[PDB]
Structure 1
Amino acid sequence: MILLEVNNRIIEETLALKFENAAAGNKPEAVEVTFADFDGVLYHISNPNGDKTKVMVSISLKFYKELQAHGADELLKRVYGSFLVNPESGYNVSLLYDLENLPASKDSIVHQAGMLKRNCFASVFEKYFQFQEEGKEGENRAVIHYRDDETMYVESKKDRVTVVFSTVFKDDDDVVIGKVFMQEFKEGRRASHTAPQVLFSHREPPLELKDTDAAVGDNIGYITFVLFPRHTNASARDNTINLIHTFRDYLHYHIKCSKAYIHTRMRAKTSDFLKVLNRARPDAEKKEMKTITGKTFSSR
């Protein structure tokens, strides 16, 4: 796996199992499954008031306030229809599937239920895609607190959409390797003839973050994507949203696989040094031939 995926496996598995149990005609059993995801997201699939016939899937996010703004539920409503209900106490979004009113083709609703977090993110993000498509300059620009110490500053103009990631890693080894993994991020635009303008900075914050509360500091890195109307059109904005959504998690993932990569080269060099040491052991004059197990040969 190189690119992180956007659909959660536990949601899909649990809902598909419940829908298979309901479609076969078996009586429904209880369900109470709580789990998490990337960026501190918390999922909870349960039943409302012990009602074993309804399954409610709730999600608690970190961009709590940006999703409550007016117009931040157009995509969620459009995709989820009647499944979207009032949030469960303590959570932020909540779907409600009735196991007796499930439409046919139960694969589509489960495929769209595993992408609940991606859809909550794309709903608060397509606002600026539309602010740019409709040909209006100076539309609202905000800061999505998609994590707790990192921010994503989104701005929409007449001809572009600027996304500035203010990012910082927790561990010291991760910080030291992330400096490299972020310095070398402008060398990617040589792999495709059409890639958004990427700018990296850790000396000083960009001039977009001087009127806003996006996280700044001397340990934070700033990565600016400039998505043009060839990356934010009504046909290639799904991939763009997926990538802008999973960028930080993908960088973290590959920072943590770089170590398991380096370990193999270190083992190789360790063996190469052992081979240089081996020149010190005087070769024996006669060895006793043994067996696969290691016992005496028992024969000539």
Structure 2
Amino acid sequence: MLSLDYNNIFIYELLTERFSSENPSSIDQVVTDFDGVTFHISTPEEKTKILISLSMKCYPELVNYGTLDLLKQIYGAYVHEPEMGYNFSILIDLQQLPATDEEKEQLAMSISMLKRNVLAAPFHRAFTKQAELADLARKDPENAPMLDKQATSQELMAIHYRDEETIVLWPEHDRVTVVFSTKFREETDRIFGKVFLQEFVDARRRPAIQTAPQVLFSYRDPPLEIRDIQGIQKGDDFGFVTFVLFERHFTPQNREDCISHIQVFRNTLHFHIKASKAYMHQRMRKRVADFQKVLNRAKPDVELERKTATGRSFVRA
């Protein structure tokens, strides 16, 4: 696979099986996801009632960012009071699901896609702010730079979802710039990530893919706007990949795909580093075989009599 999936496959399959089934069964399984997020599935009250919980270390910051309302108008009346040890909880009963199959399938997909659904609140807020500044600047072109600066100052938003990762996003009259504070431990991971990040920068440059958002990466130094932001170390070992999303990159027909893509970026990079390790393994063995071919000299020709198959010559003559 080349592109990482955008939701939890186990939740999707479980929901599909339990919706299409006729005899439900009690289940209690806790499932982990990428980036430390953990999901818990249980049926404590009724065999036909399923409760799903979300765990995330940065969730209170999401609440500060205004994610409760987004979750509410995303998931309707399904909202349920959170369970112990978890952040967001949902309770679903199979007796009230829509009869039509496509509604059930889309509900299962939406529930399985809870990760980005809860993580996309800052992106939606940034898009709304970008629209506001766009219309305000269209009201008077001469009033752009000062409102742009005040938006870079006040609306500068940030989040820490991993302890070596950070998203810094802020809107403007025409763009929503985002900064990733990438850093890889596990030395060999950082070793391969250096090459991966270098090649990832070049990509955009090539005229072949100029339609993509502009990338900006420079290790050992952060951009001008985030040196004063708390949490950003003074370039200890952290890279900083910056994507500039213009108006065309979040057109009303392409917002969700862009959000999911920009969210999954880092996990894609990690998984593909591992895939590159496997690629080495296979090539390296594949032509150490050629070295063995080179060695197979220095063996005088000899003759084996039959050695027919799964046995020893199967005959005395």
Using the size of structure 2 for normalisation, the TM-score is 0.87
Aligned to 1:210: 227
Q: What secondary structure is seen at the aligned counterpart in 2 of 1:134?
A: helix
Q: What secondary structure is seen at the aligned counterpart in 2 of 1:100?
A: helix
1:117 maps to a residue whose letter is K
Aligned to 1:4: 4
Aligned to 2:283: 265
Mean CA deviation greater in 137-146 or 259-268: 137-146
Count residues with an aligned counterpart: 294
1:235 maps to a residue whose letter is Q
CA distance in 1, matches of 2:278, 2:85: 38
Task: List per-residue Cα deviations over 1:260-287 (Å, max 9, x = no partner).
Answer: 0011110122111111111122222x43
2:224 maps to a residue whose letter is L
Aligned to 1:13: 13
Task: List per-residue Cα deviations over 1:170-196 (Å, max 9, x = no partner).
Answer: 211111000110011122223423011
Q: What secondary structure is seen at the aligned counterpart in 1 of 2:169?
A: strand
CA distance in 2, matches of 1:174, 1:115: 28
CA distance in 2, matches of 1:238, 1:53: 32
CA distance in 2, matches of 1:229, 1:66: 27
Alpha-carbon contact 1:66-1:72 (below 8 Å) kept:
no
- Matching of residues 230-241 of structure 1 within 5 Å: 230-241=248-259
Q: What secondary structure is seen at the aligned counterpart in 2 of 1:2?
A: coil
Measure how far apart 1:70 and its partner are. 5.3
Measure how far apart 1:85 and its partner are. 2.2
CA distance in 2, matches of 1:252, 1:10: 21
Among residues 184, 187, 190, which one is paired with 2:202 in the alignment? 187
Q: What secondary structure is seen at the aligned counterpart in 1 of 2:108?
A: helix
Aligned to 1:43: 39
CA distance in 1, matches of 2:225, 2:298: 64
Among residues 104, 126, 134, which one is paired with 1:128 in the alignment? 126
More helix by share: 2
Alpha-carbon contact 2:220-2:237 (below 8 Å) kept:
no
Aligned to 2:292: 274
CA distance in 1, matches of 2:109, 2:96: 18
CA distance in 2, matches of 1:188, 1:94: 41
Matched, 1:296 2:291: no
Q: Which runs of 5+ in 2 are unaligned?
A: 137-147
Cα gap change, 1:112/1:143 in structure 2, threshold over 3 Å: closer, same or farther? same
Aligned to 2:180: 165
Alpha-carbon contact 2:220-2:238 (below 8 Å) kept:
no
Alpha-carbon contact 1:62-1:148 (below 8 Å) kept:
no
Aligned to 1:94: 89
Measure how far apart 1:299 and its partner are. 7.2
Measure how far apart 1:199 and its partner are. 1.1
Aligned to 1:256: 274
Q: What secondary structure is seen at the aligned counterpart in 1 of 2:224?
A: coil
Matched, 1:147 2:156: no
Task: List per-residue Cα deviations over 1:72-105 (Å, max 9, x = no partner).
Answer: 2343222210112222222111122122222223
Identity, in percent, stands at 49
CA distance in 2, matches of 1:70, 1:142: 9
Runs of 4+ in 1 over 4 A off after TM superposition: none
Task: List per-residue Cα deviations over 1:180-217 (Å, max 9, x = no partner).
Answer: 10011122223423011101111212222212124433
Cα gap change, 1:70/1:281 in structure 2, threshold over 3 Å: closer, same or farther? closer
